[PDB]
Amino acid sequence: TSAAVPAQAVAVTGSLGDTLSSVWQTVKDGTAAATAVMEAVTGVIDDISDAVDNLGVTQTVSGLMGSLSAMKGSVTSLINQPAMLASSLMGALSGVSSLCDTRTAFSTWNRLAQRFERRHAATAGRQGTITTSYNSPVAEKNIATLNYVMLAAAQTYRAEAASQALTAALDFSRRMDNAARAPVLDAPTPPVFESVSDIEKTTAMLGAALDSVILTASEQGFSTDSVQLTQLRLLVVADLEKRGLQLAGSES
Amino acid sequence: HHLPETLPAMVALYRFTGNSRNWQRLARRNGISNPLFVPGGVSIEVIN
Amino acid sequence: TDLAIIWTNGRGDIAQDGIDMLTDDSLTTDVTISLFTDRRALDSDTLPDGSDDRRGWWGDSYRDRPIGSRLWLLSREKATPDTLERARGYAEEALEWLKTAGRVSAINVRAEQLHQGWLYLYIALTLPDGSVIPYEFKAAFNG
Amino acid sequence: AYSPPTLSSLIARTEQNIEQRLPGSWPQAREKTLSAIAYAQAGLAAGCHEHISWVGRQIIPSTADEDELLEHCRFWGVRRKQATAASGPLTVTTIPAGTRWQRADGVVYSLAEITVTALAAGEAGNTGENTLLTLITPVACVVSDAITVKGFSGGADIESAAELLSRLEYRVQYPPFGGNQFDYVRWAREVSGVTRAWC
Amino acid sequence: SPPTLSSLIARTEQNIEQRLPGSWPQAREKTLSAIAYAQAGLAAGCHEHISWVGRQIIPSTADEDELLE
Amino acid sequence: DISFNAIPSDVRVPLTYIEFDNSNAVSGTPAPRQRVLMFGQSGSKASAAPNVPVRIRSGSQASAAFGQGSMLALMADAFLNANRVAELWCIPQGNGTGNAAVGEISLSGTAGENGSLVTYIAGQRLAVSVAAGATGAALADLLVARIKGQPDLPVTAEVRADSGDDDTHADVVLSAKFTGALSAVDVRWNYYAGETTPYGIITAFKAASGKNGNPDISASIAGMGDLQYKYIVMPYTDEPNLNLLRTELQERWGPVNQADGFAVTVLSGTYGDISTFGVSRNDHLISCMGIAGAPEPSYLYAATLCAVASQALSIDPARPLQTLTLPGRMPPAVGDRFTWSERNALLFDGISTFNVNDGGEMQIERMITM
Amino acid sequence: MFYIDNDSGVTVMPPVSAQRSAIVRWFSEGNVITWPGMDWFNIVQAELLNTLEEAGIQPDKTKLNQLALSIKAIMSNNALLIKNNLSEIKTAGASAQRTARENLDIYD
Amino acid sequence: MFYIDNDSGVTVMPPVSAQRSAIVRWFSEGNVITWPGMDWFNIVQAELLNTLEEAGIQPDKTKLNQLALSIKAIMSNNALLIKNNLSEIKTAGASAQRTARENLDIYD
Amino acid sequence: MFYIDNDSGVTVMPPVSAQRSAIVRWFSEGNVITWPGMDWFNIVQAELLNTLEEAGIQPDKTKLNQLALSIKAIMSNNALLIKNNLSEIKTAGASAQRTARENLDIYD
Amino acid sequence: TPWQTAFLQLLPSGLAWNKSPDSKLSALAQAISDVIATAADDARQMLRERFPSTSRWYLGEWESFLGLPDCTSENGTLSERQRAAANKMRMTGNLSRRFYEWLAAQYGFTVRLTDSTEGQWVTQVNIYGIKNYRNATVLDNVLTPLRVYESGALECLLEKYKPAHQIYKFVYHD
């Protein structure tokens, strides 16, 4: 269905926040583990701030930029307190989503998803190494869970944006009348979602990405996180297949 | 009603009343642990 | 593209083909399922058996429509026109759900008695202009 | 998890998984066989979920049923008080060991005036006063009918589950009792006959 | 330690291939593969419920109400 | 109706008689009447003269007139609970040749958990609760008490001990009420799906290898009398008795003696024996059914088959007997049922076959004369 | 005799748990060391005892060639022999000889 | 089935070690304490599984007489049977019957 | 080879115990937990080696189908084959051929 | 198998469907239902894991919660670890010699607490039937030796659980 996607997005974001708050662990202040965790969190904030700065060319984003700057400045306070860290991160993601129109939402969320995927792949490709032996285990766990949660949140927001773009395109099509009428003298959706092959490619990409995310969630951040991501996909892919392709009333 | 063989609770309920949605009530009231194996020979109380 | 039902020895079953099972994307599977699965008999019907059990499916209360056909009520009949008329009516009622949708245009079903002891049903549909070519097979025997 | 999913949700999720994984797209109204396969899978999963819930209810003696509460008692070393056969006097005047008088109801009171024991160990062995009993196997020494001026007593049924759980709780909770003046008084008073003691 | 979802997929595919000789359910976009994936999802849910049934046997890792009991 | 002799001649007071019945005959008028005849043995204390037809209307009357648990009483009750319209006439017989020993049960002990032990003696299930540590002697005593309590079983039991006090290996010796080729029984401790024996209990059954012989039916054939018994049961699948019955039935069905007949029997044996017996007979008055597993004895199936066939043919003669369910009969195990090709080949030897529905009920898939 | 007579075995065989993995699994001491378990021992000794019982040989602890004797007995029961010169097929009955010859294309 | 079905096992068997003793060795509780190791268990399990594979029966867990069925299946696949009455020669072909008669010295 | 190769074996096989229980016994975990002991391992190993030696093959460590090879060799030494139609009785001589024909009732 | 029977019964009933034990529907039903069969086996073994006397997955947790790993738990035998956990979980008792004899014998040993020889508080623990051999069971590892030789398990146990005031004196007999 199409009306049941935002509720599932809200549920997925809530579950991801809860799993981050439940898995995050505290570390000693002066250690290299704390230094690495600080660097990772600051990097995530940097990615979000870059997205907001790209968004701000046309709009006014000063309030969100200031909030992000304050959160970057107060990193050491947030590391010790897990609930505030996850709550603030999801609030920042929702703030980024609050500045996106139906035109730019898919593009900005795709860019953020790629940016987070780069970091997740880079940090997950190094599993067994003599250098990785030196890193503390709790720091590595607290970094990997954060990376996965950020990636999953970005992908879920991208899927919801795609569904909303489909709705906007169908409303644009519905705008024009269909009845026979005489002409009268007059005196006063993203392009990637217009073609059909483009929609097929988008559906394939979304399905593959969410399937990979679920497979990863089967280990780190398991349980509800995966159950919710599977449901989200079964809803988003169904909506794209039915409304996007309109397989009922389309003849070749 | 007796059962000629051990049936799942859903099938046993549907055969006797025709609405299988209340399939947990039969298992709970009879006292079966696994609803998939409802005993065959013993008497079974079915609510219509 | 679901699995296809293949008839052998008077009893249909799913079949394999190369690596996996044989697949079907036509009305053949839909018709052979809607015709030859027993749906729940009414309260007032007289069952051919001496028993008091009516068939159906545990999912009939989960699938928005009764599953199959009431052709099982004619398990033991004598050669009289009443049974032929009843078989015609039951086939029409079982397959009218297709005509309700747009998957078929018209249904023409007739009943007859061929060589003694044969209940012959001739069901001819009218697929629309866009429907895919249906599957084609014959019942087969072995051993 | 904490709450098992509904069968309707299981059905919808499995059917959509199969449909979206297949290469094609199914029409609006169809009777594809894979739908029935998915419904059967969902039913199997729901039955397993209910069994797992039943299993999870049995891990604490407070909510466990009788059979598993018996396993808990067996582990902890508690015993169950079995049924007690009713016994009493059988006034008959005017003999093998297996002489069994019969009540008018149908129960049997055997020999081991005489204090006879009911063969059955249920409460049924409890009878009122002035109830007669007849002999099934003649002894050729006395008349068959008795009087039993005082009715039989005893005859308790099996120990109930609530009492068994309470006794298990007492066994778990009670403290160790070492040497002490009060403990010596209690030990020297628990014997049969002693009605006062000092330490 | 419940099996992961990928391990469950593999186990279901092995079972299907063993029961139907000469078959290869790992093929992409195929009926056996779809059936295996759906069954793996159901089994993953069931195994998660089993894990939650566990982990409350001891008071240390039990939940709140079970710990109080 | 009510016979004029019902009210005694000594009364002249207004009386207001009253009667109750249970049959299915609604009109009360004499339609073309059916008088099914039933051959069968009767145990001791029968109090019925052998070889003379007796009219029975109730299972209680049949039991009181032919003893408790005798195969004639069992068949009469099975037929009566399945078909009410027809009229029953039963002719008791004597004893066979062999002894009455049928076998022994052996039970070990030291049960490891609470449970229930179910024993299917002759299709009748006896369930006894097994406590935490009940031993073999206690379980055998309980089983013997249950067997003696229930009289409808065609067996009586006694208990025998062993030198192994613990792990008692107690033996329950069984003995049939009537002596004949049908005196054997079959035990299947676990029949349904969920049922199982408690862990730690060992059970076995040893059956005597002696061979018996069916009673002769020449006297019963002579005493049948001049009547049209539409369906005969006769659960004696023996060559010398079949010869006499077929000779009498072929003497009937002729133009000179216009009296009809038909025999339905059940042969409980392996596939080769069933096929050979089907090939052997070659007559058009007997229609026997071959079975393999048969937890119940053959005469129960014969009685129920006769009941359903008689009702379905009296209602409408020209209607096939394809799909009818024998009410309350236990089909064989899944592994012992014949396959489709085996049934197809069995229909070519005159042996009618059966089927099993989606439920546990069994169908009468096709009925064919020999 | 053959079974566990070390006064550590139960009289009734415990039920065998259902199949978990389809592929063959072997033992390894080095990434988790494996343990045999009761099912493996029970299955192996049950197979050996079932072969012994199929051959009609009662187990006895003194002898240690009963598997070879069992195989030889299965041979002598269910196979033709070179030292018999087809005698086994001709002591059975005349129909056996008729079938053998008509099979070998030796008829009237 | 007959292999180890526990969660502890490796889908690839570890290679067996090289030979160390040329004389037959045994177990002893007492005078050196002995431990089984993976090699002995793997060898026994592989022998049973390979016998099953040679017979052609796939291993199953519920059944226990599969070794006896394996021996009987090998017996039928390789040797003549009393019940069959020399049907395998005919099944093979006509030249087989010709050569069988030739060996039995039945000329035209 | 087939025996223990962990450098923890005894060259002389320790004697077996007596026969203690008359009924069969099976492994269990929980009663008391079951332990195999040296007797069970020794019996199983000795029987496998005994059948391997009786067939005529010496034990080896590399090969892993030696039970199947043993069954095949026992087959080939004592029973008629299918590939060898009747060459065994052809080689046995003329008396064997005449006895086979006479017992098949092909004479005079 | 009962699970495949349950699956077949769940599947629809009619003429088109073949539920004979040799058809493709049955052959696929077995594969479909075996996974849930294994799941049910795990959920059933949780009932055995409920107690520390028989637990195998949760031995580590039952030992961490009880603080078990100590002298009375033997070297590596899983049976002895289970026994130590199952005794420590339900060990509460008095200081009497009868109770100490019972506690010592519950671990498999055999001692008797006889009167002193030199004082009044110094009771004599006469230990009979000394045996340091423990047979390897089927639960423990494949690499463990057939016999594990452990000594001094009873000594430190009794010294740990001895009365505060009293001092024991151990004597070994045969």
Numbering used by the authors:
A (entry chain u): 151 to 338, 383 to 446
B (entry chain s): 447 to 494
C (entry chain A): 2 to 144
D (entry chain T): 2 to 95, 101 to 118, 130 to 216
E (entry chain H): 4 to 72
F (entry chain x): 3 to 372
G (entry chain l), H (entry chain j), I (entry chain k): 1 to 30, 34 to 111
J (entry chain a): 4 to 177
Article excerpt on this structure:
Myophage Mu is a representative of contractile nanomachines with a simple tail baseplate. It has the capacity to infect a range of intestinal bacteria and has extensive applications in genetic engineering research. The structure of extended Mu can be divided into four distinct regions: the DNA-containing head, the connector complex, the tail, and the baseplate.
The baseplate was classified and reconstructed by using RELION software, generating a final resolution of 3.3 Å. The simple baseplate is comprised of eight protein components, including a hexameric tube initiator (gp43), a trimeric hub (gp44), a trimeric spike (gp45), six wedges (one BW1 gp46, two BW2 gp47, and one BW3 gp48), and six trimeric fibers (gp49 and gp50). The tube initiator protein gp43 is composed of two domains: a tube-like domain and a helix-rich domain, which are connected by a flexible loop. The tube-like domains from six copies of gp43 form a 24-stranded β-barrel hexamer, analogous to that of the tube gp40, which serves to initiate the assembly of the tail tube. It is noteworthy that the helix-rich domain comprises eight α-helixes, which extend downward and form extensive interactions with the baseplate wedges. The Mu spike protein gp45 is comprised of three domains: an oligosaccharide-binding (OB-fold) domain, a β-helical domain, and an apex domain, which may have the function of binding and penetrating the cell membrane. It is noteworthy that two additional spherical densities, which are presumed to be Fe and Ca ions, are present in the apex domain of the spike gp45, which is consistent with the reported X-ray crystal structure.
